[PDB]
Amino acid sequence: SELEKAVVALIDVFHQYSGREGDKHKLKKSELKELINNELSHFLEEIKEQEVVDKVMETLDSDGDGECDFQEFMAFVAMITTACHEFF
Amino acid sequence: SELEKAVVALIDVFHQYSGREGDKHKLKKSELKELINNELSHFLEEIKEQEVVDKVMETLDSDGDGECDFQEFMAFVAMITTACHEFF
Ligand SMILES: [Ca+2]
Ligand SMILES: [Ca+2]
Ligand SMILES: [Ca+2]
Ligand SMILES: [Ca+2]
């Protein structure tokens, strides 16, 4: 279904970015930045300042290890989806 | 992008089921049941017993109003996505 296909797109997109550097199952700041700029260009403003990257990661990083793991990424998708929902 | 398209599929699918009866922005038990059986047939077992529907709703209904609103639905998608992630 469309729902099942959206679930796999979430996993696919996370894995495309998390495996580029260092830990293959987590997003460090540079991976998280490219995911936003390449895949969220219609919803979010392009990130160019280091301070914005730093702030986004602080916001998402719940277990405070400095990286975004798959749960924290899902919390981010929820925030974006919810915001979109509410706009419309 | 594939990510942006998965975000809109989440909103689209929720709205297809939440607007069938009563409150148009929430899922009551009968809407939640048909969403599962029609759209999650590859990941979840078909729901046939009332007790299973009741249990799923209790689990998802955080604000305890007996219905699944768009936030609680997003918490459900996270649980399914996460489970899929972990299986593989
Ligand atoms: Ca990584
Ligand atoms: Ca973390
Ligand atoms: Ca409804
Ligand atoms: Ca509720």
UniProtKB/Swiss-Prot annotation, chains A, B:
Compartments where found: Cytoplasm; Nucleus; Secreted
Binding site for Ca(2+) 2: D61, D63, D65, E67, E72
Residue span(s) of domain EF-hand: 12-47, 48-83
Pfam family, one: S_100
GO molecular function, one term: kinase inhibitor activity
Gene3D superfamilies xref list: EF-hand
Cellular component per GO, a single term: nucleoplasm
Residues that coordinate or bind Zn(2+): H15, H25, H85
UniProt keyword annotations, A-Z: Acetylation, Calcium, Cell adhesion, Cytoplasm, Metal-binding, Nucleus, Repeat, Secreted, Zinc
Subunit structure and binding partners: Dimer of either two alpha chains, or two beta chains, or one alpha and one beta chain. The S100B dimer binds two molecules of STK38. Interacts with CACYBP in a calcium-dependent manner. Interacts with ATAD3A; this interaction probably occurs in the cytosol prior to ATAD3A mitochondrial targeting. Interacts with S100A6. The S100B dimer interacts with two molecules of CAPZA1. Interacts with AGER. Interacts with PPP5C (via TPR repeats); the interaction is calcium-dependent and modulates PPP5C activity. Interacts with TPPP; this interaction inhibits TPPP dimerization.
Official protein name in the record: Protein S100-B
Source organism (scientific name): Bos taurus
